[PDB]
Design an enzyme around this catalytic site. Structure first.
Site, short mmCIF file in Angstrom:
data_model
loop_
_atom_site.label_atom_id
_atom_site.label_comp_id
_atom_site.label_asym_id
_atom_site.label_seq_id
_atom_site.Cartn_x
_atom_site.Cartn_y
_atom_site.Cartn_z
N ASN A 1 15.41 -24.68 20.79
CA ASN A 1 14.35 -23.79 21.28
C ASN A 1 13.49 -24.38 22.38
O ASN A 1 13.06 -23.64 23.27
CB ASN A 1 13.44 -23.36 20.12
CG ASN A 1 14.10 -22.34 19.22
OD1 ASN A 1 14.37 -22.62 18.05
ND2 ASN A 1 14.37 -21.16 19.76
N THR B 1 9.81 -25.22 13.28
CA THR B 1 9.27 -24.13 12.49
C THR B 1 9.39 -24.38 11.00
O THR B 1 9.22 -23.45 10.21
CB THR B 1 9.97 -22.82 12.85
OG1 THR B 1 11.36 -22.93 12.54
CG2 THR B 1 9.82 -22.53 14.34
N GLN C 1 18.20 -15.50 9.83
CA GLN C 1 17.27 -14.79 10.70
C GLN C 1 17.60 -15.01 12.17
O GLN C 1 17.70 -14.05 12.95
CB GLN C 1 15.84 -15.24 10.41
CG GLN C 1 14.82 -14.68 11.39
CD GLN C 1 13.39 -15.01 11.00
OE1 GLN C 1 12.58 -14.12 10.74
NE2 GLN C 1 13.08 -16.29 10.95
N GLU D 1 18.00 -12.39 2.83
CA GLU D 1 16.74 -11.72 2.59
C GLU D 1 16.66 -10.45 3.42
O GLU D 1 17.23 -10.39 4.51
CB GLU D 1 15.56 -12.66 2.90
CG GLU D 1 15.46 -13.14 4.33
CD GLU D 1 14.67 -12.19 5.19
OE1 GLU D 1 13.92 -11.38 4.60
OE2 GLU D 1 14.78 -12.25 6.43
N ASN E 1 16.60 -15.30 22.69
CA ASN E 1 17.79 -14.59 22.23
C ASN E 1 18.48 -13.87 23.38
O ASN E 1 19.71 -13.80 23.42
CB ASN E 1 17.42 -13.60 21.13
CG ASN E 1 16.73 -14.27 19.96
OD1 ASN E 1 16.98 -15.43 19.65
ND2 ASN E 1 15.83 -13.53 19.31
N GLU F 1 41.45 -21.39 24.31
CA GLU F 1 42.00 -22.15 25.43
C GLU F 1 41.19 -23.41 25.71
O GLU F 1 41.75 -24.49 25.91
CB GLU F 1 42.09 -21.27 26.67
CG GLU F 1 43.07 -20.12 26.56
CD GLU F 1 44.51 -20.58 26.48
OE1 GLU F 1 44.83 -21.63 27.07
OE2 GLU F 1 45.32 -19.90 25.81
N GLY G 1 17.21 -22.16 5.69
CA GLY G 1 18.00 -22.27 4.49
C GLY G 1 19.31 -21.50 4.55
O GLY G 1 20.37 -22.05 4.25
N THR G 2 19.24 -20.22 4.92
CA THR G 2 20.45 -19.41 4.98
C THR G 2 21.40 -19.93 6.05
O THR G 2 22.55 -20.25 5.76
CB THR G 2 20.09 -17.95 5.26
OG1 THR G 2 19.30 -17.87 6.45
CG2 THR G 2 19.32 -17.37 4.10
#
Ligand SMILES: Nc1nc2c(ncn2[C@@H]2O[C@H](COP(=O)(O)OP(=O)(O)OP(=O)(O)O)[C@@H](O)[C@H]2O)c(=O)[nH]1
Ligand SMILES: Nc1nc2c(ncn2[C@@H]2O[C@H](COP(=O)(O)OP(=O)(O)OP(=O)(O)O)[C@@H](O)[C@H]2O)c(=O)[nH]1
Ligand SMILES: Nc1nc2c(ncn2[C@@H]2O[C@H](COP(=O)(O)OP(=O)(O)O)[C@@H](O)[C@H]2O)c(=O)[nH]1
Ligand SMILES: [Mg+2]
Lengths: 439, 429, 260, 113, 183, 39, 439
Positions: A206, A179, A11, A71, A228, A254, A144-145
């Site tokens: 974060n 989170t 995500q 997902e 982001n 480099e 997880g991902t």
């Protein structure tokens, strides 16, 4: 030529990739449909977008990105978003069900049935590029991902592509804001794989972004969108050296040999300044010395890690805009004259600088301000031992009486994997303090 | 000294069409056939290739030859395909089938009569027929088979006149036909006996020239045959225009062919440079000679480093001094005498024609009878033996009237020619 | 310690026969530098590479590889071996003073079209008894065969060709003697052989001037390949036709006419 | 745009040298201009007794002007002369598709001649 | 297998009298059976092969497909009993040009035909016991114009009764046949 | 408002003048260049 | 000139030919009424239609095809379809009573019923052809009429027209999907004609086209219409070399010689690529190497035949569009360097190439997308041994109990014809083994 393949996993990877590609399209004047309408002053047959966009015979440009997620909601939202025609129908791999914040789930069960397809997409990306510089991987190990599938993908990319450069702008768990709860487990498990199969990993937590945006960008309620966008600005500043001309042109590989003193030492601080709102942009005479000082300030860091609690083994400044090499030397000299920030005794040089003449952009939808010059630090410091000691103490607290361990071991991971990765991180922090030690 | 040309097969027809385009360029002839050249020299010796009509149209002295009528339509669908006389277009209802036997015995015999008739008419019209030129490919059906039948009949009818062939020998790396070695083996033995001289053209070497030398991205058969057209014009440039050191085709044959069987040659053209490097290159006799003798500049797949030069020929074009063009041969012989045969002193024949190919300061065509042609003869020989051990794809040839032992005879001719080339490569004084 | 490899060239253990006849060998059955001394008394480092050929400096000492026309080729498999092992040939060795061929069946009635090509194919052989049986059977059949040798010529050309292409000097001498005996066997056989000069002559031209006051004391063997080539060329011209000289010259440019 | 082809009817005035039946020949041809590629092709209708074995055509390709520049749709105009490869055609008519396309593009096509 | 063995006069490849007659034969059986039975006509034990499908079940010599026979004898004589049912046999031989050419004879075949690898023939078998004689050299010449070298493999299909298979160099007469080759 | 294989076909437009002289005239022979009326 | 006569046998052949003829009409600008409009869209050469359409003095183009089905449903429904005015009222032969999925019924009782009139039609099909290249027959060997009547028609055509080319683009039963139970019987019985009385036979089994449509087209619900459209695209690609100009134009006989090593060995695999949807068409750099590799990939197979189970004997490539000759050569070179696919030892060349300048057309409302270039492969390989062994294994399984044999016996077939067919098969698989055996 000089292509860089983006790999957005999880995500967080998908969100930061969306921000990065919006910024890159604004950089290159590529419309959401994927074409340049009309540019006269910008000369025709000029292809500075080859590193991020591949041309088609119809004049349409396709990003060199792989949005891999287990997902479907985030990938489907990206599909239905503004960049429908821009993003490729393939190279946008979406699975059936999420990794459930489980490294074992993302690395052994659902990761296995999608990594082959992801690698096929990566091969279809790479065979197009005749001058591929490397792979820019965006993920968060907290989930997880981003932990498990990212680990598996990096492990197979290492053996598939040999010694190709791997820049992972990774989001490690923050000191106290989380989170998730199994986030220390995921981070500890993923760090083992990343140590062996990550050329350079970059801090992207974060809390530091939140604090920086609250103080300097002067907005009370920043969110993931602002985080982001700042990450995309940092990535564009880092990668613009191979996109535009400059006095000190630097490629992705480099600084790999300049920022990594030892094979196990590849986790790096990132800083960017002037990250200021337009409210104070005209207030401050953002000169080269001022922006360099703000970058070196630990307050402006993009991770909640303390440079003063460690020693800068190396730094790599990326000046972007009208920065003069003479001003670069002046800023470096006045930095070396400082005492609070100090280098190790065995690395007297400790400095790398790369100047690109293209000024940074301002993205609508973001709170950044237009400036004729900016600079991004990518610096290897011994201070990363602090954050890794914090996260591994959390891991020891969790694994002391084996909380949440049945969830991980059910998917198929060895029970001894937790322990063995823990001695890995123990050796990691050990070599941190011993390389920070003097001679 | 008129020369009459024939284009057999699809490859031969395309190569001849581009060659006639180039020749009409050099002689100032438009597709309408009218002469608009600005000098007397172009019209002075235009009768070698063109015959004038009542209205002044300069019809090429060419005969087209292919069983497929679609490519006969296509070759004259070009702008310079209107030059050829309509009656010279001789074609059949059924295609060659990409079969040497079918193009040489069944459909070749039923069609060769008209081709001999028109060729005899052209020969009679010639004031002094110097010779016949043929353009074809050894891997095709009618380009190889019917071409060899044609060359045999013209050898029978005109024994003393010069015989020229431009054969595009196929090769496995550009193998676009599974019976290419069969066709090449069945045609090479005819070419050895029925051809005074047989220039060899190869697709891998042509693409190597178009990529490594000319640097242009995607030239098709058009630009590929442009080089062959330039070579085929530079062969008889000395006939068509006067020069300090004149030469003709029997000039080259006598000074180039040491023994009757050894008449297979490699080709090269200079200058050859990319569009972007055209203005950065200083044209000179030294550069011309270096491009001539450069291995990558050869337009057939056989490295000259693996063999020795029986003889070389240098057809230079452009206003140039003579002792420097001879001194380049001096240097080449002296500092590559290991790669040149000792018992043939001064292996390089030289000739100069003042008129250069149009669009060039100075140019040259290279004729090479090197002994390394045996390598490319073999590399088809083992392929032929490989398919002939199991005799696959042989029922097509046998059902068209061919005999089994003819393939062994063709093998005999290949191996004998290869042995001759080896013998004269390693022969000592 | 170490191991010794004897030089077995020209010995009983010579492996040349084994490595040149694959079917053979079976049993009876089956650092500082100068950084301020730039001086004119040093010359550039020579290239001496295969790529140096046709360069501006020159090839140098580099030479093209030998084409190997004289290379002693490998013997292709012969139908004579398989036929003899199967028992088709009624041939045996009559041991005695000088070995000779004993014919089991009546020899005047055997199909020459079926047997003589096998014998001519057997000249390529290198071990006893195959080579001896093949060559002596060829000698007998050609010496006293009759008018049935002539029709077999076109299927006899191929074995002679293949024996010649082996480049083995002994096989060349043997097939040359057999060819001479073939030519002196009838009247029209030479004229029949004339059109097949294109397939028999190249090896003769290659080996025309190869020789092995010093008297050649070994001459009863008649192993002189060049002398045999010259003799067989003269004999071909003699027992050929009107076009024999021109056909021979078409393939041996150094030939000199005898009848003229 | 893959199937968009402009039509241009034209005629060639060609003198005849030594024919008992005629002294002038008119060769009616059709020019196809492919808007996909800019290529042009020339075709000739095969008459029943024209006396030609097969008509003279020109396969589609980038047909250049005698100076060297390629011929675009602007060069092809009705009532005007188009010259290429030494051959001159006087355009006189087009098909309704080309007519309507020129009308909407804004170029006023001359009436057929 | 018989390349190094004596090959003259007679060479039996199958005989229903040996203790284990199928030493050099592979009994490829599918929906059938190969067994030694007692024939009432001759009061002797002979091979007996049945199968609904003639192609699937058969016996082939040699058993090992890579291995091959080496019999030079041009005549093949098979003492087989007509079971009034579909029957076929296959003989692979090596020709002089080194091809494996494959001669088949079946009773369900309509007409003979020649194809670049195979030559199929129909057979007519009289009632009772039959002595089929197969002249490999002559039939190879007739159907291929090619010399016969030696046979590589013999494969007689199912749905028949078999006494003895033997190669002979020439057409031996019934009187000249040895007593053990009689019937 | 309005790259197949038909793009690649390149055929020379007309007779192209020589580059030997600035005027583009077809060059004279060596005889004509060197052996002229004496001046 | 270069006329080719299309034959359609059976219902499957009828739909296959219907798709082929709509594709031909779109390629040659022929409206369903049968005449070109006043405003051409094709702009193709004037002689392009001559090989497939006879031109009447009134200006209408009549297809050179013979539809021949033993039951009136498909033929009458085509007679009532869109191409009423396109198709000849004759040349559209219809039987009254169906062959009922019986080879014996379609070959003896009704095959001889209709074959005389079929040849009567074909006589006037051929008399108008002055340069007839051959007959392209579309049928399915698994049906009754398509097998038996096709066999009888091929027998009569071979015995009366000499050595004219016979391109049988036939549909074989698939390894696992089969719509009939007597389908292996029909296939094994049609092998009599498909081994002797046909020249080059191309397999178009349904499963491989099904998988191609499911994977490449990303369409979940493909049908006989899509399969027939793909088959028509393949046929058009094969015949474009003679229909239009090209760098290497090849007629039927040209690859007839190159693709058949032995008279028995004439069954050849087919594979077409790139076959992509409009969604993914514009996001990919379709290169010659990519399309050739996709063709050689099992995804591009139009036959359920894995190449690695055998050795390629003779491959032929038909490129369409802007394909460059040395681009073809580079694709061939990379194919030779590839090791996972291997060629037979006695065929070193093994490659036939033919380039046509006409890009493939797209049927409006279809699933094919506009492709700048494409390529179709027709390949003889020894990998057909496994599919032949599976089909005659199924035949043996049914024939062991003599199931469904009385139906064939009662329609005029001798019961030993099944044994003859099985013998012909068993000869075919291991003669393929013979030709594939190493020297
Ligand atoms: N900067 C940024 N980080 C995000 C965003 N979304 C999720 N994250 C990071 O993801 C971490 C938690 O992991 P998850 O919520 O499971 O997201 P993930 O890592 O991609 O893994 P999954 O969502 O389970 O597939 C947090 O610590 C965040 O740092 C985002 O939109 N922007
Ligand atoms: N590719 C393709 N295959 C088809 C089509 N229709 C049927 N088939 C297949 O082809 C096989 C045989 O069909 P046909 O050739 O028409 O033979 P049939 O089914 O007996 O036809 P009839 O005898 O008229 O009933 C069927 O089992 C189907 O699986 C089609 O439209 N396209
Ligand atoms: N240089 C060149 N070679 C060609 C051309 N066309 C075909 N060839 C070569 O010719 C060979 C095939 O010959 P083919 O056309 O079948 O001969 P044909 O059957 O007698 O017409 C191929 O290997 C090609 O390499 C061309 O336009 N230029
Ligand atoms: Mg998620």
């Amino acid at each position: 030529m000089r292509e860089a393949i983006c790999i957005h996993i999880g995500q967080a990877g998908c969100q930061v990739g969306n921000a990065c590609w919006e910024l890159f399209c604004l950089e290159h004047g590529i419309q959401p449909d994927g074409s340049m309408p009309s540019d006269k002053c910008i000369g025709v047959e000029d292809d500075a977008f080859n590193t991020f966009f591949s041309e088609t015979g119809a004049g349409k440009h396709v990003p060199r990105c792989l949005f891999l997620d287990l997902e479907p909601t985030v990938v489907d939202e990206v599909r239905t978003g503004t960049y429908r025609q821009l993003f490729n129908p393939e190279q946008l791999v979406s699975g059936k069900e999420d990794a459930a914040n489980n490294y074992a789930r993302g690395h052994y069960t659902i990761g296995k049935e999608i990594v082959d397809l992801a690698l096929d997409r990566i091969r279809k990306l790479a065979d197009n590029c005749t001058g591929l510089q490397g792979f820019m991987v965006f993920h968060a190990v907290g989930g997880g991902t981003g932990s498990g599938l990212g680990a598996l993908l990096l492990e197979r990319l290492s053996v598939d592509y040999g010694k190709k450069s791997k820049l992972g702008y990774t989001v490690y768990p923050s000191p106290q804001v989380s989170t998730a709860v199994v986030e220390p487990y995921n981070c500890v498990l993923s760090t083992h794989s990343l140590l062996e199969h990550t050329d350079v990993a970059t801090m992207l937590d974060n809390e530091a972004i939140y604090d920086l945006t609250r103080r300097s960008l002067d907005i009370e309620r920043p969110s993931y969108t602002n985080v982001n966008r700042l990450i995309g600005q940092v990535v564009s500043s880092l990668t613009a050296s191979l996109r535009f001309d400059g006095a000190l042109n630097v490629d992705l590989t480099e600084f790999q040999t300049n920022l990594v003193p030892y094979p196990r030492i590849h986790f790096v601080l990132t800083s960017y300044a002037p990250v200021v709102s337009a409210e104070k942009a005209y207030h401050e005479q953002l000169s080269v010395a001022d922006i360099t000082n703000s970058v070196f300030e630990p307050a402006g860091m993009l991770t909640k890690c303390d440079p003063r609690h460690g020693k800068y083994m190396s730094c790599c400044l990326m000046y972007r805009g009208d920065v003069v090499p003479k001003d670069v030397n002046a800023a470096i000299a006045t930095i070396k004259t400082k005492r609070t920030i100090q280098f190790v005794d065995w690395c007297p040089t400790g400095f790398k600088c790369g100047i690109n003449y293209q000024p940074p952009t301002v993205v609508p939808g973001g709170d950044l301000a237009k400036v004729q010059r900016a600079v991004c630090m990518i610096a290897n410091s011994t201070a990363i031992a602090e954050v890794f000691a914090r996260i591994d103490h959390k891991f020891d607290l969790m694994y002391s009486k084996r909380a949440f361990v049945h969830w991980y071991v059910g998917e198929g991971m060895e029970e001894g994997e937790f322990s063995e990765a823990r001695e890995d991180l123990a050796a990691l922090e050990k070599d941190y303090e011993e390389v920070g030690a003097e001679s | 000294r008129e020369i009459v040309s024939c284009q057999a097969g699809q490859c031969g027809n395309q190569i001849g069409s581009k060659f006639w385009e180039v020749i009409s360029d050099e002689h100032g002839v438009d597709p309408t056939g009218t002469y608009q050249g600005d000098s007397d020299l172009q019209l002075e010796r235009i009768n070698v290739y063109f015959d004038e009509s009542s209205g002044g149209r300069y019809v090429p002295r060419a005969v087209l030859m292919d069983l497929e009528p679609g490519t006969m339509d296509s070759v004259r669908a070009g702008p310079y395909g209107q030059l050829f006389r309509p009656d010279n277009f001789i074609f059949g209802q059924s295609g060659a089938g990409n079969n040497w036997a079918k193009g040489h015995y069944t459909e070749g015999a039923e069609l060769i009569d008209s081709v001999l008739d028109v060729c005899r008419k052209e020969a009679e019209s010639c004031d002094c027929l110097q010779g016949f030129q043929l353009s074809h490919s050894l891997g095709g059906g009618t380009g190889s088979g019917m071409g060899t039948l044609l060359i045999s009949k013209l050898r029978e009818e005109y024994p003393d006149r010069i015989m020229m062939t431009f054969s595009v020998i196929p090769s496995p790396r550009v193998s676009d036909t599974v019976v290419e070695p069969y066709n090449t083996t069945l045609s090479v033995h005819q070419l050895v006996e029925n051809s005074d001289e047989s220039m060899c053209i190869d697709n891998e070497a042509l693409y190597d020239i178009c990529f490594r030398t000319l640097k242009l991205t995607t030239p098709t058969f058009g630009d590929l045959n442009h080089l062959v057209a330039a070579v085929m014009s530079g062969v008889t440039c000395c006939l068509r225009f006067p020069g300090q050191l004149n030469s003709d085709l029997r000039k080259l044959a006598v000074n180039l062919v040491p023994f009757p069987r050894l008449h297979f040659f490699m080709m090269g053209f200079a200058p050859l440079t990319s569009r972007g490097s055209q203005q950065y290159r200083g044209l000179s006799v030294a550069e011309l000679t270096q491009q001539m003798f450069d291995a990558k500049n050869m337009m057939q797949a056989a490295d000259p480093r693996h063999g020795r030069y029986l003889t070389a020929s240098a057809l230079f074009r452009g206003r140039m001094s003579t002792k420097e063009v001879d001194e380049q041969m001096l240097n080449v012989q002296n500092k590559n005498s290991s790669y040149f045969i000792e018992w043939i002193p001064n292996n390089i024949k030289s000739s100069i024609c003042d008129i250069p190919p149009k669009g060039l300061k100075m140019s040259v065509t290279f004729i090479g009878n090197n002994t390394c042609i045996q390598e490319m003869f073999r590399r088809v020989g083992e392929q032929f033996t490989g398919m002939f051990r199991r005799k696959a794809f042989l029922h097509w040839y046998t059902g068209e009237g061919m005999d089994e032992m003819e393939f062994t005879e063709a093998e005999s001719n290949m191996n004998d020619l290869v042995s001759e080339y080896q013998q004269y490569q390693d022969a000592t004084v | 310690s170490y191991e010794i490899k004897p030089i077995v060239k020209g010995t009983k253990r010579d492996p040349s026969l084994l490595k040149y006849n694959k079917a053979a060998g079976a049993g009876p059955f089956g650092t500082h530098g100068y950084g301020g001394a730039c001086s004119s008394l040093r010359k550039g480092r020579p290239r001496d590479a295969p790529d140096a050929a046709f360069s501006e400096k020159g090839c140098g000492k580099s030479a093209p590889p030998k084409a190997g026309a004289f290379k002693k080729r490998v013997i292709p498999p012969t139908e004579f071996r398989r036929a003899y092992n199967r028992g088709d040939l009624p041939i045996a060795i009559c041991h005695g003073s000088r070995p000779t061929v004993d014919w089991k069946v009546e020899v005047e009635k055997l199909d020459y079209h079926h047997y003589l090509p096998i014998f001519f194919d057997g000249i390529r052989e290198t071990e006893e008894p195959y080579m001896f049986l093949a060559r002596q059977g060829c000698l007998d059949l050609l010496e006293r065969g009759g008018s049935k040798i002539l029709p077999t010529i076109p299927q006899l050309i191929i074995p002679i060709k293949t024996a010649l292409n082996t480049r083995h000097p002994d096989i060349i001498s043997a097939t040359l003697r057999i060819l001479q005996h073939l030519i002196v066997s009838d009247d029209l056989i030479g004229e029949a052989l004339v059109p097949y000069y294109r397939q028999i002559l190249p090896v003769l031209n290659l080996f025309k001037n190869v020789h092995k006051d010093a008297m050649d004391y070994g001459q009863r063997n008649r192993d002189d390949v060049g002398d045999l080539v010259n003799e067989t060329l003269q004999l071909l011209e003699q027992h050929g036709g009107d076009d024999a000289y021109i056909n021979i010259k078409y393939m041996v440019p150094s030939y000199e006419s005898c009848i003229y | 745009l893959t199937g968009r082809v402009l039509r241009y009817y034209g005629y060639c005035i060609e003198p005849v040298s030594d024919s008992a039946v005629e002294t002038e020949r008119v060769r009616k041809v059709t020019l196809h201009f492919y808007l996909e590629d800019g290529t042009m092709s020339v075709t000739e209708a095969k008459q029943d007794n024209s006396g030609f074995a097969f008509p003279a055509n020109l396969k589609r390709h980038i047909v250049p002007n005698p100076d060297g520049t390629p011929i675009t749709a602007a060069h092809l105009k009705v009532g005007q002369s188009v010259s290429f490869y030494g051959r001159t055609y006087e355009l006189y008519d087009v098909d309704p598709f080309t007519r309507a396309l020129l009308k909407e593009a804004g170029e006023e096509v001359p009436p057929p001649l | 297998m018989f390349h190094n063995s004596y090959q003259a006069g007679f060479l039996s490849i199958l005989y229903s009298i040996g203790s284990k007659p199928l030493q050099i034969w592979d009994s490829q059986v599918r929906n059938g059976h190969v067994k030694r039975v007692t024939d009432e006509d001759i009061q002797s034990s002979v091979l007996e092969i049945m199968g609904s499908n003639v192609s699937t079940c058969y016996i082939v010599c040699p058993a090992n497909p890579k291995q091959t026979l080496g019999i030079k004898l041009p005549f093949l004589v098979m003492i087989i009993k007509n079971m009034k049912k579909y029957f076929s046999f296959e003989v692979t031989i090596l020709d002089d040009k080194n091809m494996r050419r494959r001669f088949r004879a079946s009773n369900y075949q309509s007409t003979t035909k020649v194809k670049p690898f195979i030559c199929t023939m129909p057979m007519r078998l009289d009632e009772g016991w039959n002595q089929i004689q197969f002249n490999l050299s002559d039939f190879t010449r007739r159907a291929y114009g090619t010399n016969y070298v030696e046979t590589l493999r013999v494969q007689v299909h199912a749905n028949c009764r078999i006494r003895r298979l033997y190669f002979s160099d020439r057409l031996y007469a019934e009187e000249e046949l040895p007593p053990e080759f009689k019937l | 408002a309005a790259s197949t294989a038909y793009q690649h076909h390149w055929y020379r437009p007309a007779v192209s003048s020589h580059i030997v002289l600035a005027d583009g005239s077809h060059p004279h022979t060596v005889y004509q260049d060197d052996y002229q009326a004496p001046r």
